[PDB]
Design a protein around this nucleic acid. Structure first.
Lengths: 94, 200, 113, 85
RNA sequence: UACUCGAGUGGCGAACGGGUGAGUAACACGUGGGUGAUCUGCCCUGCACUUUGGGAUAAGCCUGGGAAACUGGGUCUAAUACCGAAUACACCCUGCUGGUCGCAUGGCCUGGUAGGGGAAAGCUUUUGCGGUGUGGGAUGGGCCCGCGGCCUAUCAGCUUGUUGGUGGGGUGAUGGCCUACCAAGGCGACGACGGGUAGCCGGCCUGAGAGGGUGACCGGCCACACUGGGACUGAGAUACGGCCCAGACUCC
């Protein structure tokens, strides 16, 4: 009665990462762009639907995105300070 | 703590005879004091207050206990007044008085307090014990032969017992079916005012 | 080390324990991982109840019972199931059932009449 | 230092710090030797002593003086520098 | 004598448990995610082992310095204390190279191959306990993020490692975390930067409810240990009953 020497690792579903859609308003850095996100949150008390804007700094290696483009992003591990986002593909150019 | 003061006094003030068979109420139906003869202005608070006074001073419960009972009954799904009266009629002292072994509620209170009774074989000497369904109430041997208990049990031809209580044996055994409903409590006075006072 | 413990509950005079799985560094009344059973020593047969499946899983993982927990496990046969010496023997002495209130009701009716 | 075992711990800690300090300084000296040799630019010597410094990194991580991952990082940087130069 | 055991060397513990709410308006807390960016002693379960050599010292004995605290020298001894080497090829690097999944760096197939390398320890005969490398669990963490919960423009501009890029350094890990160069950026009326106050929550009190107030007990996190800095040992350190320095205070 002798068993295997190596036990395979356990299978885990690889994690879901947040996705973001937005407009590029500052393509003026090196390899990094600044993009806002839209959301519709109901006011905690009054209940009126309120839109707010959040600026986000992403990293694009090739510098392929111009200023004012509808873009998609995903969450990433920190690449620098203030940089937790990445450019995947320029969804709609303008 | 119990109340020890005179009993016909509170019936006098409250306008309703509580013990039932005394002569003092009839020979003095008016409220006590120097100015018990004075004409009194009417007030809804006076009505609701005196109603509670009749209920509590008929049953013996104190204000904190009665308020807790009211909160319990209001929490209960039934109508608040009905739940009130059935809870206050589930007390051991009231059950004993109703079964006839006590000539009065004070009799029942003291006779339960001194541990002359036992429910389901356990020596229960507390008056505020609430009788549940299917309880068998018996007496202990030392109290079975004692002179006043014997007198009361042998001469027991007074007021009839209700349906849910039933005395069955010469040993003065008590047995209960169900918690009473508003027809079977059949104590005087009214419940709506009791409820409104605490709803204030 | 992850261990299987007991935690105090209940009032001053009568302790009532939960068979619990926690880390050794946690405090007795601290946070728990899984409530596995219970133990009331204040009763004549000393009520004991335990989830056999979760007990077996945790033991297989590597949990280490404390002495009272091991005694309980031996009583309920889950330790014996895990190891395999006698086999899963139920040594539990269940609470003696109490005669029904309605049955005493009818018996009293019959005796008095 | 009020309790007995903790005084004993003071003594043992001083001893352990002396030992670890010696080992760390030896590793540091060997790394500096390599760095100077490669910045000078002699691939032969760089290799012959890179082997030695790598052994020292591994057998210093083997005593618990430094973490295995740190030893791996240092070997990686060392070999990358030599290979590139 | 070794039943037994003062002091001593060596392991493990001492980072848990217990206390307080000073500080902190902050990823500190609550909730929900990520880690293809990560560590984890003791516990459980597989695989492979556990070879050979060596110097010294505490304790003891002799002696000195000191009021004390403590401490210097000689001589002497042991180990699961310390230090060499052989093997590991499951591990770590470097080079070449295949397949596959992607969420881009990239991951996974103990991929294949070539080169270099990485350890161990014995005691006890009694329900017998240990040691090393490595695969996998469980546990306990670290780091990053969305959203949420105070007052005050009679506080409008703030920021120069500050924002970003490359090479090096560092860490368990990514990252201006640090550094050299280059670009001149980054945050702000959806209130930056200031000022005041305050541990946060599960919960508690009130109220028909929404809401208002609050954070007593019990429970989970966080911060701190006379004040202010610092690192060492360690799997793990705000190290309350540890160390070093500078202070205020008490004592010899």
């Amino acid at each position: 009665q002798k068993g295997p020497k190596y036990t395979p690792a356990a299978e885990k579903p690889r994690g879901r990462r947040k996705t973001a859609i937005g407009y590029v308003v500052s393509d003026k850095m090196q390899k990094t762009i600044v993009v806002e996100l839209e959301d519709r949150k109901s006011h905690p008390l009054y209940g009126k639907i309120i839109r707010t804007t959040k600026k986000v700094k992403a990293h694009d290696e090739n510098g392929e995105a111009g200023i004012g483009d509808r873009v998609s992003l995903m969450e990433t591990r920190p690449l620098s300070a203030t940089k937790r986002w990445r450019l995947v593909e320029i969804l709609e150019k303008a | 703590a119990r109340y020890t003061g005179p009993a016909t006094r509170k019936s006098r003030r409250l306008g309703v005879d509580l013990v039932g068979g005394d002569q003092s109420f009839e020979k003095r139906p008016y409220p006590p004091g120097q100015h018990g003869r004075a004409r009194i202005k009417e007030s809804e608070y006076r009505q609701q207050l005196q109603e509670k006074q009749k209920a509590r001073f008929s049953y013996g419960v104190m204000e904190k206990q009665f308020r807790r009972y009211y909160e319990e009954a209001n929490r209960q799904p039934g109508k608040t007044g009905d739940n009130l009266l059935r809870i206050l009629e589930s007390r051991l002292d009231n059950v004993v008085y109703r079964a006839g072994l006590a000539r009065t509620r004070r009799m029942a209170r003291q006779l339960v307090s001194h541990g002359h009774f036992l429910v389901n074989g356990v020596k229960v000497d507390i008056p505020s014990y609430r009788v549940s369904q299917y309880d068998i109430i018996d007496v202990k041997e030392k109290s079975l032969n004692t002179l006043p208990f014997q007198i009361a049990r042998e001469t027991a031809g007074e007021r009839p017992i209700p349906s849910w209580l039933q005395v069955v044996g010469e040993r003065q055994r008590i047995l209960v079916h169900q918690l009473p409903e508003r027809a079977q409590i059949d104590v005087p006075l009214t419940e709506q005012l009791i409820v409104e006072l605490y709803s204030k | 080390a992850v261990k299987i413990k007991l935690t105090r509950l209940g009032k001053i005079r009568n302790p009532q324990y939960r068979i619990i799985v926690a880390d050794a560094r946690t405090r007795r009344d601290g946070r728990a991982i899984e409530v596995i059973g219970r133990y009331h020593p204040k009763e004549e047969p000393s009520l004991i109840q335990i989830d056999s499946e979760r007990a077996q899983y945790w033991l297989g993982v590597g949990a280490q019972p404390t002495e009272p927990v091991l005694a309980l496990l031996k009583i309920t046969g889950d330790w014996q199931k895990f190891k395999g010496l006698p086999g899963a023997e139920g040594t539990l002495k269940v609470k003696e059932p109490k005669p029904s209130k309605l049955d005493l009701f009818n018996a009293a009716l019959a005796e008095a009449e | 230092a009020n309790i007995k075992s903790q005084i004993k711990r003071i003594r043992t800690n001083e001893r352990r710090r002396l030992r670890n300090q010696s080992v760390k300084s030896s590793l540091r000296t060997a790394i500096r030797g390599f760095r100077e040799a490669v910045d000078a630019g002699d691939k032969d010597k760089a290799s012959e002593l890179l082997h030695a410094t790598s052994r020292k990194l591994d057998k210093a991580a083997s005593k618990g003086v430094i973490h295995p991952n740190q030893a791996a990082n240092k070997k990686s940087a060392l070999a990358l520098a030599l290979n590139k130069l």
